[PDB]
PDB file of C-alpha atoms in Angstrom:
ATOM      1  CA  UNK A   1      74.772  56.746 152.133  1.00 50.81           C
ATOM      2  CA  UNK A   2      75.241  55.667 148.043  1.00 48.03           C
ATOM      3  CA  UNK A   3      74.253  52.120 148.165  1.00 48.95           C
ATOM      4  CA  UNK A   4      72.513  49.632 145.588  1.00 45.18           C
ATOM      5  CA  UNK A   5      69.790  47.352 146.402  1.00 46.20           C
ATOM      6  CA  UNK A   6      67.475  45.246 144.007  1.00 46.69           C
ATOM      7  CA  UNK A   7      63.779  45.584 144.157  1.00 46.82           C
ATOM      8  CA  UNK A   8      61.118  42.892 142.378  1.00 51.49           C
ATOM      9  CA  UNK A   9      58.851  44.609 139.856  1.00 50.49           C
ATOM     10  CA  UNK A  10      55.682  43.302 139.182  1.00 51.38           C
ATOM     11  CA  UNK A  11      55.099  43.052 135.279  1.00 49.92           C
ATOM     12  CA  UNK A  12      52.567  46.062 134.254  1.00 48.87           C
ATOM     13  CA  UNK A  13      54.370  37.317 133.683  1.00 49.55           C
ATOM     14  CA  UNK A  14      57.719  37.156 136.091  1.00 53.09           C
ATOM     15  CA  UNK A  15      58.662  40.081 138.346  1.00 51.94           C
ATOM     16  CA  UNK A  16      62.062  42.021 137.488  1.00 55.27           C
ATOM     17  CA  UNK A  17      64.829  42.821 139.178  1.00 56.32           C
ATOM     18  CA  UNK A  18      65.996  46.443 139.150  1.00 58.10           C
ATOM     19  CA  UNK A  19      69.023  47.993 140.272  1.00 57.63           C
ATOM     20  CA  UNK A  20      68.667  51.348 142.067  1.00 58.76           C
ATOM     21  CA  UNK A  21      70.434  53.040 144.991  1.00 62.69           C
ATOM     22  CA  UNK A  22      69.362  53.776 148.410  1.00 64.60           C
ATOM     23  CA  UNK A  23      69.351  57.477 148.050  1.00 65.52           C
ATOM     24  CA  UNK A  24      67.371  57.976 144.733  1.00 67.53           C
ATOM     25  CA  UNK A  25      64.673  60.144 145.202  1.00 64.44           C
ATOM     26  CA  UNK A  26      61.594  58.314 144.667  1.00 61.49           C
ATOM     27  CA  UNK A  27      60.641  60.045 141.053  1.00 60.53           C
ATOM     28  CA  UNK A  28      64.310  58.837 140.446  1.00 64.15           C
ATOM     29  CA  UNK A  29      63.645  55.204 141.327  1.00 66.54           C
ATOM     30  CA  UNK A  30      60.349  55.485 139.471  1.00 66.49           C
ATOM     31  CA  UNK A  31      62.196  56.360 136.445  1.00 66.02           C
ATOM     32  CA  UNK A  32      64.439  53.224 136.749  1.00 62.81           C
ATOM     33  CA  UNK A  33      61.610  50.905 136.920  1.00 60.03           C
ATOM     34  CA  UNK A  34      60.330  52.548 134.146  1.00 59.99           C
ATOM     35  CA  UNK A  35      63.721  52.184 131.653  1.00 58.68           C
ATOM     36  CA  UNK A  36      63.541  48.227 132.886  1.00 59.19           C
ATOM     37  CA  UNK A  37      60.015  47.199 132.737  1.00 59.45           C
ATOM     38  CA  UNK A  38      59.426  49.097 129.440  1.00 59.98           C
ATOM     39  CA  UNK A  39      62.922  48.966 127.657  1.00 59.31           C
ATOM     40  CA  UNK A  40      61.884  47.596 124.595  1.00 59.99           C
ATOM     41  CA  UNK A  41      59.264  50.911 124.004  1.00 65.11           C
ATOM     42  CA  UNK A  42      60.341  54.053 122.770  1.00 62.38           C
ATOM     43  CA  UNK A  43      60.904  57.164 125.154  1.00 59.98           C
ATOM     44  CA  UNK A  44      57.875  58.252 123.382  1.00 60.94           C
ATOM     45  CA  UNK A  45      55.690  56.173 124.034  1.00 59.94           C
ATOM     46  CA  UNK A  46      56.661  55.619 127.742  1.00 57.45           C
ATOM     47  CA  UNK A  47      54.457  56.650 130.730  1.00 54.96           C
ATOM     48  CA  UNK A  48      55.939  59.174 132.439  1.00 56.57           C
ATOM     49  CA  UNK A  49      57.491  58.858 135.842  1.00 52.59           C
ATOM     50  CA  UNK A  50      55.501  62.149 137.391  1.00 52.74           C
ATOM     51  CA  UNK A  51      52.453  60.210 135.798  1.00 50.07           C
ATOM     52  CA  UNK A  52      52.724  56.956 137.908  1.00 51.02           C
ATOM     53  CA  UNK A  53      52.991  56.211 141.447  1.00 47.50           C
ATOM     54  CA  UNK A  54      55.536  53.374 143.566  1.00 50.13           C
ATOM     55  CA  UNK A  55      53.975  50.536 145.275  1.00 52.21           C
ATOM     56  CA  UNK A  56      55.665  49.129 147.879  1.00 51.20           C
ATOM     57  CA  UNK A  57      54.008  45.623 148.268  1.00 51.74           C
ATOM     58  CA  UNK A  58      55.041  44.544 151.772  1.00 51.38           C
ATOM     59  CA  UNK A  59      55.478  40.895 152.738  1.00 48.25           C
ATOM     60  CA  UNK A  60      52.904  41.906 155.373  1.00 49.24           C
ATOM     61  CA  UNK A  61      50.156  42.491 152.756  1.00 50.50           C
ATOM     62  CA  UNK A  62      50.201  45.445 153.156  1.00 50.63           C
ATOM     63  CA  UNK A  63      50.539  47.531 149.839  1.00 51.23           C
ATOM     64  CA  UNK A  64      52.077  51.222 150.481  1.00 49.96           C
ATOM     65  CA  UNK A  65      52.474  54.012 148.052  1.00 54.49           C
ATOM     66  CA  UNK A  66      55.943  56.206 148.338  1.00 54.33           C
ATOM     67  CA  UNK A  67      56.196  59.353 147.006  1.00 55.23           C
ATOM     68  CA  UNK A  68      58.918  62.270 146.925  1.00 52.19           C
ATOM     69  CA  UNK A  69      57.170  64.379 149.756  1.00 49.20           C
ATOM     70  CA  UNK A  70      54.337  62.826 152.104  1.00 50.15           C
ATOM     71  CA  UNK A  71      53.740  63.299 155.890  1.00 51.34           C
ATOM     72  CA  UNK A  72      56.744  61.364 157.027  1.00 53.60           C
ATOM     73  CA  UNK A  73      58.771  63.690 155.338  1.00 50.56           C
ATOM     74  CA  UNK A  74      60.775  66.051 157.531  1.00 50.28           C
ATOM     75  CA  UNK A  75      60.879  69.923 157.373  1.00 44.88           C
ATOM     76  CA  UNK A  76      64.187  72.742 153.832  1.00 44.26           C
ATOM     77  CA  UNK A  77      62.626  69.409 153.189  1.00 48.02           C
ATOM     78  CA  UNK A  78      64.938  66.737 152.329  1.00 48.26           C
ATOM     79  CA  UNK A  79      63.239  64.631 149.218  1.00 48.54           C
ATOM     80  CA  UNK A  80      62.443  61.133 150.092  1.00 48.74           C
ATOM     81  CA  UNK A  81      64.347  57.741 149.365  1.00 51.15           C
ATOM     82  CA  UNK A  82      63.986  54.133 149.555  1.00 49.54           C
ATOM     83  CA  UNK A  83      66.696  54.795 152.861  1.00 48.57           C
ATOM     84  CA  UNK A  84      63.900  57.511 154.031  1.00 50.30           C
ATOM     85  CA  UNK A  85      61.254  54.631 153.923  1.00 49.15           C
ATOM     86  CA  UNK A  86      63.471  51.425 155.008  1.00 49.90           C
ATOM     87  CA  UNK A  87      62.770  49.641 152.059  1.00 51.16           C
ATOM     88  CA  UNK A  88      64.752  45.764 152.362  1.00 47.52           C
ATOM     89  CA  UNK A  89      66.847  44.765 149.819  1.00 45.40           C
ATOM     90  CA  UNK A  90      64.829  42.382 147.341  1.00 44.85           C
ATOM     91  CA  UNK A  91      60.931  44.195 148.473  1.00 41.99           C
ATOM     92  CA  UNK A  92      58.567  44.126 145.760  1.00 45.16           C
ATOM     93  CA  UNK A  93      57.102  47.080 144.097  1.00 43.77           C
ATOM     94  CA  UNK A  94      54.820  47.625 141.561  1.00 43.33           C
ATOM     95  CA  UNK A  95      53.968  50.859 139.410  1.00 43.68           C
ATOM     96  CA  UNK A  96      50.630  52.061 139.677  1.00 44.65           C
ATOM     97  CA  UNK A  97      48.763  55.085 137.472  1.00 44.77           C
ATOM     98  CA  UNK A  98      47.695  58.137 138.565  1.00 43.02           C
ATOM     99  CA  UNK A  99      43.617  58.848 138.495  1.00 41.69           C
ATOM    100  CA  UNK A 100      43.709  61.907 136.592  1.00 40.31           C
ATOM    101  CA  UNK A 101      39.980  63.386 137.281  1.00 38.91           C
TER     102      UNK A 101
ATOM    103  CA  UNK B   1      51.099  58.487 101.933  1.00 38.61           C
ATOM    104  CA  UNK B   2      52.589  56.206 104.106  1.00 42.64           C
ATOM    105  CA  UNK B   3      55.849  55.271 103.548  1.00 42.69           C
ATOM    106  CA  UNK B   4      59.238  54.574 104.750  1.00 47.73           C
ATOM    107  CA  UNK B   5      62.572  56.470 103.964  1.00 48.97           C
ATOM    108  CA  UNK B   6      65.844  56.040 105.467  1.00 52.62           C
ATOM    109  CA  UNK B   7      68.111  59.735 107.465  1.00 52.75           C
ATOM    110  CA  UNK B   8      71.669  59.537 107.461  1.00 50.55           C
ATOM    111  CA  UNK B   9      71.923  61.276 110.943  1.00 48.95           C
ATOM    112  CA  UNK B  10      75.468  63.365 112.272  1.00 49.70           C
ATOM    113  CA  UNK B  11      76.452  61.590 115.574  1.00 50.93           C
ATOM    114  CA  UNK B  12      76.183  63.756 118.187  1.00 45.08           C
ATOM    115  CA  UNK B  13      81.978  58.909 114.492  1.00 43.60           C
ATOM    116  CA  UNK B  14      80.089  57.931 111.348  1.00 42.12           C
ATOM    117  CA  UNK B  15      76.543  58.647 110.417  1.00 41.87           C
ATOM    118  CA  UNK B  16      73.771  56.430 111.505  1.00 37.20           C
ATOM    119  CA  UNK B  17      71.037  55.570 109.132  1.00 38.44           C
ATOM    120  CA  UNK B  18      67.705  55.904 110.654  1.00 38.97           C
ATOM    121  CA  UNK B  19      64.236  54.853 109.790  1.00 34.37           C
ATOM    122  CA  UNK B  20      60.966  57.131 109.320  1.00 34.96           C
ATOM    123  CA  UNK B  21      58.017  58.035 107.679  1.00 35.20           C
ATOM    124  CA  UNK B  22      57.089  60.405 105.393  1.00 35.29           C
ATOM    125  CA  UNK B  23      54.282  60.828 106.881  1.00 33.17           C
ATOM    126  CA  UNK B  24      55.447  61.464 110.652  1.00 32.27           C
ATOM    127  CA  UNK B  25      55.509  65.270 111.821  1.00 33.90           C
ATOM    128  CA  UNK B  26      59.003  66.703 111.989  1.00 29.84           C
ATOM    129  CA  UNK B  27      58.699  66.257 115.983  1.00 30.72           C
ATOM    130  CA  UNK B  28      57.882  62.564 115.045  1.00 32.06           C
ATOM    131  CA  UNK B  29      61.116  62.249 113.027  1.00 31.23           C
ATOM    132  CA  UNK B  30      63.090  63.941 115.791  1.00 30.95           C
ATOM    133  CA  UNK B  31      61.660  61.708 118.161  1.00 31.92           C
ATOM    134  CA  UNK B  32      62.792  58.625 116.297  1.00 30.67           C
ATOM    135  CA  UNK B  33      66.116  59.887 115.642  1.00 27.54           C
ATOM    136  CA  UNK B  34      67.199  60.536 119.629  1.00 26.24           C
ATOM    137  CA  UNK B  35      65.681  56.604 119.744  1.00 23.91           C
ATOM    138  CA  UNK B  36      68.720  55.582 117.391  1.00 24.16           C
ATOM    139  CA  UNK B  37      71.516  58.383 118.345  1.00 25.54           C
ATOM    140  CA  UNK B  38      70.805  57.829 122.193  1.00 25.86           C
ATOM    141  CA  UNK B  39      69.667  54.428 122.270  1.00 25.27           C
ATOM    142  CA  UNK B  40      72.240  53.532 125.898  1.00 25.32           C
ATOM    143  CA  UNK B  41      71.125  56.930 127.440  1.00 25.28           C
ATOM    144  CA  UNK B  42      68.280  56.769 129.496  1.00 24.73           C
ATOM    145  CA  UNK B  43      65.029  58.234 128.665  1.00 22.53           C
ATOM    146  CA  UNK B  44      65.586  60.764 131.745  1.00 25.32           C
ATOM    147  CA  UNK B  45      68.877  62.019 130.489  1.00 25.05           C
ATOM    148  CA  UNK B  46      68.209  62.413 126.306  1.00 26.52           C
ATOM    149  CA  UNK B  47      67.452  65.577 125.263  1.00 25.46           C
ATOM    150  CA  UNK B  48      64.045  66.145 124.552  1.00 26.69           C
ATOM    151  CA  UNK B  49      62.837  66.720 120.722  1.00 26.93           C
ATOM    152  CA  UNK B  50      61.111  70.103 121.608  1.00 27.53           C
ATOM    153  CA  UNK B  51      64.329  71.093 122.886  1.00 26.74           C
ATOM    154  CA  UNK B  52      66.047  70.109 119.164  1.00 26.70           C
ATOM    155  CA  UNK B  53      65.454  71.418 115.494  1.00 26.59           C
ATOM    156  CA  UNK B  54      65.883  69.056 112.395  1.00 26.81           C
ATOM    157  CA  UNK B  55      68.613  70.295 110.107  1.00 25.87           C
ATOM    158  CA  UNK B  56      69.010  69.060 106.665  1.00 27.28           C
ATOM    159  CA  UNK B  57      72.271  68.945 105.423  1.00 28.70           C
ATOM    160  CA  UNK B  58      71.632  69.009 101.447  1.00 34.81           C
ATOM    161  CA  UNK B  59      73.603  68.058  98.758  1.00 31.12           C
ATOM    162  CA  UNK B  60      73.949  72.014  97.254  1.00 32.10           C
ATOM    163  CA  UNK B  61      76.047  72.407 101.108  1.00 33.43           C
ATOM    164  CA  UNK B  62      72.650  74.631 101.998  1.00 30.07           C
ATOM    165  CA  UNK B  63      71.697  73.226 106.055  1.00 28.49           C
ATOM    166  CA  UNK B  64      68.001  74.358 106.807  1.00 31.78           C
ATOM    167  CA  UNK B  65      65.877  73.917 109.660  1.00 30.74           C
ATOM    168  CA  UNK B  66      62.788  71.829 109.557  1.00 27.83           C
ATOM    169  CA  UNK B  67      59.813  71.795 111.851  1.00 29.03           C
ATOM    170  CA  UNK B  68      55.991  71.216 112.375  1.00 28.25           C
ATOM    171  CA  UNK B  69      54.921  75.244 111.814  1.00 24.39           C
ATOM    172  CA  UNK B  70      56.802  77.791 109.620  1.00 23.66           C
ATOM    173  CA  UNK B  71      56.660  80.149 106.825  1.00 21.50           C
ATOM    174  CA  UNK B  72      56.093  76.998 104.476  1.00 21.83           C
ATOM    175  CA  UNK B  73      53.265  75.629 106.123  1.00 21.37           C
ATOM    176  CA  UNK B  74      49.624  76.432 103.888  1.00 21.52           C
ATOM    177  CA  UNK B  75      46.458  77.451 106.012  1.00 16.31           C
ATOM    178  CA  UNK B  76      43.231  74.656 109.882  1.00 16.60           C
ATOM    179  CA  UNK B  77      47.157  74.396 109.576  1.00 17.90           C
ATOM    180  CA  UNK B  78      48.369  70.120 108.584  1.00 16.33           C
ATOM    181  CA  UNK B  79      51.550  70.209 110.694  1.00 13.74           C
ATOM    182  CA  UNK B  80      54.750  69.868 108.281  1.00 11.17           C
ATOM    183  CA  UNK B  81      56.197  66.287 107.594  1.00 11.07           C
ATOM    184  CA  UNK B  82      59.241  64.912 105.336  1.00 10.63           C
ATOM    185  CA  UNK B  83      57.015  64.574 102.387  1.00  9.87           C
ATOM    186  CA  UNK B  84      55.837  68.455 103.113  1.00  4.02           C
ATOM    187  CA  UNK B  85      60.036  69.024 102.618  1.00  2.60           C
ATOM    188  CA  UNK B  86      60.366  66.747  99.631  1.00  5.64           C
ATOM    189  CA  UNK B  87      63.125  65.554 101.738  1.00  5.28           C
ATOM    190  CA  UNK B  88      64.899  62.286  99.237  1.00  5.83           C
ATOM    191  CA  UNK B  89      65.741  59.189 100.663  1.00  8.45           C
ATOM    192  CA  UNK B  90      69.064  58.658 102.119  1.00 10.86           C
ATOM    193  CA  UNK B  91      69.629  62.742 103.281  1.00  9.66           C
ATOM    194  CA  UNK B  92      71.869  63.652 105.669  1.00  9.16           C
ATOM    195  CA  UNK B  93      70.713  65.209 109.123  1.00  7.02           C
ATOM    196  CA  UNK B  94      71.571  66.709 112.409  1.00  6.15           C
ATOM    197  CA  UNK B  95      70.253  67.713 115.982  1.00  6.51           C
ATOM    198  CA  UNK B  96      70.873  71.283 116.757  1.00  4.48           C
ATOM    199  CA  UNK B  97      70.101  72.596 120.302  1.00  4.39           C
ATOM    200  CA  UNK B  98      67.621  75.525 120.446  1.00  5.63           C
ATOM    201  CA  UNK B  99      69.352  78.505 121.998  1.00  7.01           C
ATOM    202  CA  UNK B 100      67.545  79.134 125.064  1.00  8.50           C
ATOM    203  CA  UNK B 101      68.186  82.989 125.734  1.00  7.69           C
TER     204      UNK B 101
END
């Protein structure tokens, strides 16, 4: 499948809507979060998408981190997507860094 | 010093004049210059300034390379910057891509 849907990101202030498609890879939807929430900042001076972590924020309450590979990935392992994970159109993320010790 | 001076940088069309310091390392400059030349690309898909060398496209028709280390730098190394070049306002520039073989 080579859909779009929008998800909500919170502001690392009003959430923003991003554009991605349903078969990004995660880092891949990472990165377009990243070129939204933080367009007006040089590449430089960006965090980096390997760097950070997606937060699905489920209407729930629940608050779910997806990643590239994890245990509900399948085995040649097939990268995950927001398709992989069933993410509804309009769910709200939020980016979250990566503790580093 | 701290001070500003303008590149006339080769699209990669006409030239695009670009801000800097004199004071920024050469890997500074070429990291402000791929902010101008590639400011619609996304971060993910610009080439990346370590992949790049700084030419300078003199006056005389001579086109050298610039960069943080090389035979020009004096000895604890300071890393090379325009001012190190006695690069003048208003030179012209390119982006060359670093064979990688």
């Amino acid at each position: 499948d080579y859909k779009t849907l929008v998800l909500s990101c919170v502001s690392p202030s009003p959430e923003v809507p991003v554009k991605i498609l349903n078969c990004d890879t995660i880092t891949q939807v990472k990165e377009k979060i990243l070129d939204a929430i933080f367009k007006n900042v040089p590449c430089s001076h960006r965090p980096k998408a390997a760097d950070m972590d997606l937060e699905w924020r489920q209407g729930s309450g629940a608050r779910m981190i997806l990643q590239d590979e994890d245990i509900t990935t399948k085995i040649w392992k097939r990268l995950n997507t927001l398709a992989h994970y069933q993410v509804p159109d309009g769910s709200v993320v939020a980016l979250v860094s990566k503790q580093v010790t």
